[PDB]
Design an enzyme around this catalytic site. Structure first.
Site, mmCIF file in Angstrom:
data_model
loop_
_atom_site.group_PDB
_atom_site.id
_atom_site.type_symbol
_atom_site.label_atom_id
_atom_site.label_comp_id
_atom_site.label_asym_id
_atom_site.label_seq_id
_atom_site.Cartn_x
_atom_site.Cartn_y
_atom_site.Cartn_z
ATOM 1 N N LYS A 48 0.820 -1.209 0.000
ATOM 2 C CA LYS A 48 0.000 0.000 0.000
ATOM 3 C C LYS A 48 0.859 1.267 0.000
ATOM 4 C CE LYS A 48 -3.934 -2.403 1.855
ATOM 5 N NZ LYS A 48 -4.450 -3.090 3.075
ATOM 6 N N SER A 105 -4.718 0.478 6.954
ATOM 7 C CA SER A 105 -4.689 -0.714 6.121
ATOM 8 C C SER A 105 -6.032 -0.972 5.421
ATOM 9 C CB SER A 105 -4.223 -1.953 6.899
ATOM 10 O OG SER A 105 -3.343 -2.672 6.049
HETATM 11 B B1 LIG Z 1 -2.971 -6.347 4.026
HETATM 12 O O1 LIG Z 1 -1.932 -7.018 4.924
HETATM 13 O O2 LIG Z 1 -2.813 -6.905 2.605
HETATM 14 C C1 LIG Z 1 -4.470 -6.547 4.560
HETATM 15 N N1 LIG Z 1 -4.635 -7.931 4.985
HETATM 16 C C2 LIG Z 1 -5.764 -8.626 4.988
HETATM 17 O O3 LIG Z 1 -6.819 -8.108 4.610
HETATM 18 C C3 LIG Z 1 -5.718 -10.060 5.468
HETATM 19 C C4 LIG Z 1 -6.220 -10.142 6.903
HETATM 20 C C5 LIG Z 1 -5.152 -9.676 7.883
HETATM 21 C C6 LIG Z 1 -5.641 -9.877 9.299
HETATM 22 C C7 LIG Z 1 -5.020 -10.826 10.105
HETATM 23 C C8 LIG Z 1 -5.459 -11.015 11.415
HETATM 24 C C9 LIG Z 1 -6.516 -10.253 11.910
HETATM 25 O O4 LIG Z 1 -6.942 -10.435 13.192
HETATM 26 C C10 LIG Z 1 -7.138 -9.305 11.103
HETATM 27 C C11 LIG Z 1 -6.699 -9.113 9.796
HETATM 28 N N2 LIG Z 1 -6.616 -10.827 4.615
HETATM 29 C C12 LIG Z 1 -6.297 -12.096 4.304
HETATM 30 O O5 LIG Z 1 -5.266 -12.632 4.717
HETATM 31 N N3 LIG Z 1 -7.130 -12.776 3.491
HETATM 32 C C13 LIG Z 1 -6.617 -13.841 2.644
HETATM 33 C C14 LIG Z 1 -7.515 -14.317 1.509
HETATM 34 N N4 LIG Z 1 -8.966 -14.137 1.579
HETATM 35 C C15 LIG Z 1 -9.437 -13.661 0.281
HETATM 36 C C16 LIG Z 1 -10.402 -14.649 -0.343
HETATM 37 C C17 LIG Z 1 -9.424 -13.353 2.576
HETATM 38 O O6 LIG Z 1 -10.624 -13.364 2.835
HETATM 39 C C18 LIG Z 1 -8.555 -12.479 3.379
HETATM 40 O O7 LIG Z 1 -9.051 -11.510 3.939
#
Ligand SMILES: *[B]([O])([O])[C][N]C(=O)[C]([C][C]C1=[C][C]=C([O])[C]=[C]1)[N]C(=O)N1[C][C]N([C][C])C(=O)C1=O
Ligand SMILES: OC[C@H]1O[C@H](O[C@H]2[C@H](O)[C@@H](O)[C@H](OCCCCCCC3CCCCC3)O[C@@H]2CO)[C@H](O)[C@@H](O)[C@@H]1O
Length: 265
Positions: A48, A105
């Protein structure tokens, strides 16, 4: 704490995971500590910052304005969008979208911005334009976090990400005002910034963007230094570890502690 490299090694053994790290002088670009710095790791939300570098490049060229208001819709949203969810009625400026993407984020903010630079392919082309021939974005949020073992999609290397961050922040590829804006967004991180300050000794500057994905993927790109100066870029990625989020956070913090205690190089 141990010497930085000894701590990095220890973190791998305890995580049963792979760590990638570089520590780079921001002013000169000199590489100082490096570990798996040429190996690939999912960028997750650390992308990002690069995204908003590309947005700023469009602003500098007169092809975008940070003031421009985008009136997006609910069908445009993906998960983890705390700021953009609040503005279906009234929209957000391009500058607000970058602030939300970097400091909270916000995933939908990132996707909206990603479309403005030509999608994943457009952002990858921007990377090639600034001389990063390694980093690649292939997918949108949130699929780009999948971090499948052995998958090269949506990856960088510590060395490439650090060089790219330095180019964006200091090389005058971006205007002075744009370089200052990108830095300020990182200074304003709300996901991890305040927590990191709460555990840093007095005098240590921090600006950062974090990322989290599947299969233990976790990372941070940061500016860090004593004397209240952004002295060094530090990039740390973890991948392929079954560890808890809490441990992944602690292991990154432990590497940071080793750097702080053993800073002179
Ligand atoms: B950035 O790092 O690219 C934003 N990251 C995400 O949106 C992550 C979730 C990160 C997270 C971890 C632990 C928490 O308590 C809260 C948030 N998203 C994902 O890892 N994924 C992976 C794949 N799929 C897509 C089909 C997801 O639904 C998803 O959200
Ligand atoms: O002697 C050096 C210092 O030792 C301790 O500081 C500790 C601090 O109490 C602890 O909270 C932190 O944890 C590490 C926190 C790191 C935060 C994440 C770092 C990020 C930043 C950018 C690089 C990637 C990771 O370690 C330092 C060094 O031992 C003392 O508390 C402090 O008075 C003293 O100046």
């Amino acid at each position: 704490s141990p010497q930085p490299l000894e701590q990095i090694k220890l973190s791998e053994s305890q995580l049963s995971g792979r760590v990638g790290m570089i520590e780079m002088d921001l002013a000169s670009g000199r590489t100082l500590t490096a570990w798996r710095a040429d190996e690939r790791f999912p960028m997750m939300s650390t992308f990002k910052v690069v995204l908003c570098g590309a947005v700023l490049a469009r602003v500098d060229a007169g092809d975008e304005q940070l003031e421009r208001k985008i009136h997006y819709r609910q069908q445009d949203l993906v998960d983890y969008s705390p700021v953009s969810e609040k503005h279906l009625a009234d929209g957000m400026t391009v500058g607000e979208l970058c602030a939300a993407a970097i400091t909270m984020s916000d995933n939908s903010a990132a996707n909206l911005l990603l479309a403005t630079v030509g999608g994943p392919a457009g952002l990858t082309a921007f990377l090639r334009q600034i001389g990063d021939n390694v980093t690649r974005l292939d997918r949108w949020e949130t699929e780009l976090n999948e971090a499948l073992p052995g998958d090269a999609r949506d990856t960088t290397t510590p060395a490439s990400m650090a060089a790219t961050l330095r180019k964006l922040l200091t090389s005058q590829r971006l205007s002075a005002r744009s370089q200052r804006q990108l830095l300020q967004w990182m200074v304003d991180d709300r996901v991890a910034g305040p927590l990191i300050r709460s555990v840093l000794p007095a005098g240590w500057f921090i600006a950062d963007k974090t990322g989290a994905g599947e299969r233990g993927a976790r990372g941070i790109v940061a500016l860090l230094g004593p004397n209240n100066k952004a002295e060094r870029i530090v990039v740390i990625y973890l991948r392929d570890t079954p560890a808890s989020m809490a441990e992944r956070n602690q292991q990154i913090a432990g590497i940071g502690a080793a750097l702080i205690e053993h800073w002179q190089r």
